[PDB]
Amino acid sequence: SREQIIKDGGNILVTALVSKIEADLKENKTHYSIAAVTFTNKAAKEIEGRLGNFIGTNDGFVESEIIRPFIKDAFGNDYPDNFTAEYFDNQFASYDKGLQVLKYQNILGTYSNPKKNFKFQLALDILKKSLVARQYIFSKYFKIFIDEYQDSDKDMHNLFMYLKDQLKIKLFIVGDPWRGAEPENFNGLIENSTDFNKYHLTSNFRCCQDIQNYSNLFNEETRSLIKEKNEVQNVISIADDMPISDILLKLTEEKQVLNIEAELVILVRRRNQAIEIMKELNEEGFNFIFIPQTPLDRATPNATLLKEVIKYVKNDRYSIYDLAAEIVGNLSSREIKEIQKIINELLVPNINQVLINQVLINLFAKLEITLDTREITAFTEVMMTNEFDIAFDTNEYLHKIFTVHSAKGLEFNQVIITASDYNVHYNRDTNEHYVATTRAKDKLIVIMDNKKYSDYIETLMKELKIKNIIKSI
């Protein structure tokens, strides 16, 4: 359930955040603050965006809230508090050597073993050795929010448990059952812990109740999740009794169930449908653009970073810092510039497959990340043509057409789909239909042009004694 989580004041495990922080901050009456910690600055910024508390990365939290302010009190004055964090060089094999590098080179470095986390070991050691540190953290925070917990390493887990068990801080933990990852942390809590309430959320939780309800109707497994409303507002059915341009005018100006001034996305199955639709719409005063599928639209491990590199290469106004926000950790501008220097070699005149291959190797080597050869192939293909450029564009486009595939993992405010694109009555297009119906946050329109689809909906409604699932206009 959703509102149950909101009512829940204690330690929480969620299997798959901004929602709970907003609520908890509202009803907080005390002086205590919250902290939200992510793996990436991208994830942090996204939270800080929708909101005296701490919102930042794991590494920024332990460095700024624990290590820097209290290392001298814990270890003595000969330890620095103006050290530099370095992710790339100055790796080491033991805690004592890490202490040496910090003490003598003024560098907060990393273990060479990715399963060990020097910063978090250091932070825990400092808490255990400094009353002042414990008193600060104790009186500062009442709750900490932690993202992607399945990727947390053993030392992160040790610190968070200590915060919970010694400094009386509640934990709100989100994850999904990364080189540092110890999945047993999160799994262990799920299977064994007695001091957490535990919830499971489906992928469409983000959506408004009407959109959750509709999308949950179609799979036998999610039907039980449906919480019927007396009336439906945000999922709408419209007849295909007029051209798409008239349909759009009816939705926006006549019935005003769509806002033409907000983001509006039409989902199709194929490029040729998008062309058809654009050929009409843009001749009738609209201005839609089709965002093509690209070779990087595969579920590959490094898809996100690879798309960022392409964005940077092809758009001279795109900032290297936005690329860097997607990299795990809290890299200094100095290190980001070392990454920039590597990537900039893709900008030489007459770039070719050989050079590109070399850049990719240099980059992912530096990031200590394994690269699939088929990723190199897909990346190189995008580099060597302008065919897919619009998909990596920096411009903001309000009115867009996507295939359901290109739309995967994206979120829009308003979405139009066409029933005849999904033959779910014959158990076809069922994953695509779930994806398509859950892209929208606030408004979903179904062009109802498929008799078997609509009959199928009515059949399920009768079976479930549902009276309202979609608003017909």
Author numbering: 2 to 17, 27 to 61, 67 to 192, 199 to 494
Structure paper excerpt:
Gabija is one of the most abundant prokaryotic antiviral systems and consists of two proteins, GajA and GajB. The Gabija system consists of two genes, gajA and gajB, both of which are indispensable for its anti-phage activity. GajA was characterized experimentally as a sequence-specific DNA nicking endonuclease, whose active site is located in its Toprim domain. The other component of the Gabija system, GajB, was predicted as a UvrD-like helicase, but its function is unknown.
To gain structural insight into the function of GajB in Gabija-mediated anti-phage defense, the crystal structure of selenomethionyl GajB was determined to a resolution of 2.0 Å using single-wavelength anomalous diffraction. The asymmetric unit contained a single GajB chain and 265 water molecules. Several GajB residues (1, 18–26, 62–66 and 193–198) were not modeled in the final structure due to insufficient electron density. The crystal structure of GajB revealed a four-subdomain architecture, in which N- and C-terminal domains are each divided further into a RecA-like core subdomain and an accessory subdomain. The two accessory subdomains are formed as inserts within the respective core subdomains. GajB shares the four-subdomain architecture with UvrD that includes two RecA-like subdomains (1A and 2A) and two additional subdomains (1B and 2B). The root-mean-square deviation (RMSD) values between the Ncore and Ccore subdomains of GajB and their counterparts (the 1A and 2A subdomains, respectively) in UvrD were 1.9 Å and 2.8 Å for the 115 and 141 Cα atoms, respectively. In the Cacc subdomain of GajB, it is difficult to recognize even a partial structural resemblance to the 2B subdomain of UvrD. The gating helix and the GIG motif in subdomain 2B of UvrD, which are involved in formation of the ssDNA gateway and dsDNA binding, respectively, are missing in GajB. It also lacks the separation pin, which is a β-hairpin motif in the 2A subdomain of UvrD that contacts the ds-ssDNA junction.
